[PDB]
């Protein structure tokens, strides 16, 4: 139990669902961004809408109160803000509000207290300008990495909630630039591509999993960052992914041991863009999109529903470290061992202190 375990449960569930929907595509998401955005959103919900949303995010409202959930995300946000200076990290929230709406004071107080959310004015009557405005805001917070989060063709919103996350970290064990070389990467049975393959021969935290058919290594970045690189055995990608759980992570952490490893990992430049409505509904999070949605804690002068939940994430991974960003938007409307990663593999980016799932990747093609 606890926030950390719940957020991991949600992260892996979302990941599994997205992988199932796009069997041949790279997957890249920021679970913590999505969880934080929807948790903040839940502050405005009531009744069944609220109960369903919080359950979907992995929380049990018997056993834990809503206040405790929001306190959890507050401390999480606060710790990301106070990252070690060797890690450049940004993580925050914003609410864009049309002039026609007035937030109930309790809701405005809550989003400011728990999520430190900015509250910015927009003119939804001009969706072109408003969507450009929100996009610019997110682009700036992610230092240019997340662009065009919204389009002028999206259904106009009178309220938009945004979470952004960005960081640039350096490996505690970087790869030698001079040792990078082109190698074959086997996407599938009929597809082989040329990729820049990084190499280092080091004392690496390694595990050949005895319960799942996979090998993995843990690579740290400064500022308490940990990255799991997981290589499923041939033909076992789906088996490993389907099995991912909080218990799996605990087992890996306990089983990882220092070993001499010739570690080949390719440079990774990937991205993910998602309209999360359909997959969230598969996961039981649906009522908030319907004409029966209850957002009465935002306002009682109007009945709102969510129209769209969008998510974008980008990863740049190279010899020196990891540069990554993500953003989630919610719109509302009136109702030695040789280990070579030359086949599809999994990347998990965690904050070690909180065990927050910052990013998850399924890499089908690292180029």
Author numbering: 15 to 349, 352 to 383
Please give me the paper's original passages concerning this structure.
The hormone binding globulins, corticosteroid binding globulin (CBG) and thyroxine binding globulin (TBG), are examples of naturally occurring site-specific carriers. These hormone carriers release their respective ligands, cortisol in the case of CBG and thyroxine in the case of TBG, when their reactive centre loops are cleaved by elastase, a protease released by neutrophils at sites of inflammation, taking advantage of the site and temporal specificity dictated by neutrophil elastase secretion. Upon cleavage of their reactive centre loops, both hormone binding globulins undergo the canonical serpin conformational change that involves the incorporation of the cleaved reactive centre loop into the central β-sheet A as a new β-strand.
Ser 100 on the s2A/hD loop and Val 236 on the s2B/3B loop of β-sheet B were mutated to cysteines so that under non-reducing conditions, they may be induced to form a disulphide bridge. This forms a direct covalent bond between the s2A/hD loop at the top of helix D and β-sheet B, which along with helices A and H make up the steroid binding pocket. When binding assays were performed at 37°C in the presence of the reducing agent, TCEP, the change in binding affinity of CBG-S100C-V236C-T349R after reactive loop cleavage was very similar to that of wild-type CBG. However, in the absence of TCEP, cleavage of the reactive centre loop resulted in a 6.5-fold decrease in binding affinity for cortisol, as shown in Table 2. We went on to obtain the crystal structure of reactive centre loop-cleaved CBG-S100C-V236C-T349R, which revealed that the binding pocket was indeed perturbed by the presence of the disulphide bridge. This could explain the relatively small effect of these mutations.
